[PDB]
Amino acid sequence: HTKERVKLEGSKCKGQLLIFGATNWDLIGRKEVPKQQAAYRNLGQNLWGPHRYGCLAGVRVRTVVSGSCAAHSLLITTEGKLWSWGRNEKGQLGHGDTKRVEAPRLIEGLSHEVIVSAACGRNHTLALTETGSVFAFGENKMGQLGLGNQTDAVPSPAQIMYNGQPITKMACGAEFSMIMDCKGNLYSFGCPEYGQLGHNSDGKFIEYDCELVPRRVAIFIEKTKDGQILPVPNVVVRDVACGANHTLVLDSQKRVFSWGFGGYGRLGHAEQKDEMVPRLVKLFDFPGRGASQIYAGYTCSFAVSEVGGLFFWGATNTSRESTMYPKAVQDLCGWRIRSLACGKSSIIVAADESTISWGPSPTFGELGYGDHKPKSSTAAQEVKTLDGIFSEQVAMGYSHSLVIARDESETEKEKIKKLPEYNPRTL
Structure with a gap:
């Protein structure tokens, strides 16, 4: 009940954006x-x-940011300065207008803040300061900015309407947001479709009764083999990740919970029904079989287990197949997973000393294979264009990839210099 004070450190990564x-x-x-x-x-x-x-x-970068639903991006410099670029129809860039920006640009409205993390929905953005305060910008039609009202576009960053313990992690779905405080409480806001906010209601009346400020996610449940629904008490959230219409949580006991739209198996409960309350993903509740990392793609989910194995569920290819239960990605057997992202369908992974990617057609270059090379791949491929380059962190939008390339050594710097430079024609 004493309000905790935090000074959050940014990412320890340092390199150049690709x-x-x-x-x-x-x-x-x-x-x-x-x-x-x-x-x-x-x-x-x-x-x-x-x-x-x-x-x-x-410019040295410590964090690159996008979201599986997004056509915009952000980066945080080693000085903790937030820049953005990309689609801006709803003001999601935070530059005070709705004009598209081709290349990374410092957000003037947050230039006096030290930003440690950010997250992107379809048309909105959240940014977290070192003191645990959240600023929001972009589309607010569904209240996904948490400002206490509904407006089509909020192009200038605004602090959310929230007076609780400081925030330490965030995630965004297509039209909703999740924020996690320093005590492990979770709050959600925005569109209630599918029950994705986790309050046991879809808010539908077609109109939605949206959550316009952060609302505590009060209950986490498990389902027994007999079908009994039981609360799991005192869940302390440690991380949160979202796809378009679902959310994954990792708690202090290494358990995974998921909820929202069940289509394509993205929740992982060996069935496809929606879950309007966070539900325990059974596999990760076994001793020594919990999770250490969680990730989400547009309609899919990932966890890295305690012993380091990668698991996938949901669909990368909704036109063809789906996976209803967490399934080991055997092609990465023995590899140490450092960072992972997924867009609509493509996956990129930083593992051991490589960057690995795969996904079905259509792709747009986000697999990174290069000109005159295959555009897609059914199975994991080493991204050979990044030979000799160490990816510290990876991120994906719906159709694009961002990586931080380590540039400590002269050899590394020279390798990175050889890569083509993009200077897009302006406006």
């Missing part, structure tokens, strides 16, 4: 750009192999 995949920000996930963006119909291109940004010369 990008690959789709960079026509207005075209991503669409057959054509919206009529309003017609001038941009040919701005941006599919980058089939990794590129640097010219505008990032001399």
Whole structure:
């Protein structure tokens, strides 16, 4: 009941940003750009192999950020400064307008803050300061910014309406948000569709009774073999990750919970029903078989177990197949997983000394294989364009990849310099 005071450290990563995949920000996930963006119909291109940004010369990056639903990105510099670029129809870049930005740009409205983390939904963004305060910007039609109201676009960063213990982790779904405090309490806000906010209601009346400020996720449950629903008491959340319409939690006992839309098996409970309350993912409740890391993609889920094995469930290819229960990714047997991301369908992993990627067609370059090389791959492939380059962290939007390339040695710096430089035509 004493309010805790935090000073959060940023990521320990340091390197240069590389990008690959789709960079026509207005075209991503669409057959054509919206009529309003017609001038941009040919701005941006599919980058089939990794590129640097010219505008990032001399800029050292500690965090790269996007989200499986997003056509925008952010980065945090080693000074804790937040920059953003990409699609901006709803103000999700935080630059005070709704104008698309081609290349990384410092967010003036947060330049006096030290930012330690950020998260992206379909059309919104959250940013976390070192003191545990959350700023939100972008679409607020469903209350996903947690500002106490509903508005179509909020293009300038605004502190959320929240007076509890300081926040230490965040995640965003397509039209909702999750924030985790320093005590392990979890709060959600935004669109209640599918029960994705975790309060045992879909809020539907088609209209939604949205949660306009952070609401405590009060109950976590398990289902017994007989079908009995039992509360799991005193869950202390340690991490949270979201796809479009689902959420994963990792708690202090190394247990995984999931809830939201059950379609395609993304919740992992050996069935497809929705869960409107966080539900225990049974596999990770066994002694020594808990999870150490969780990740989410657009319609899928991942966990790395205590002993380091990668598990997947849900669908990377909704047009073809889905997995209803956590399944070991045997192709990565014995590999030490450091970072993982997934977009609509593509997966990228930093493991051992490699970067690994795979996914079905269509792709747009986010696998990183390079020009004149295959565009897709059913199974994991080493990303050979990043030979000799160490990926410290990876991130994905719906159709693009971001990595932090370590640049400590001269050998590394030279390898990174050889990569093409992207200086996109402006406006």
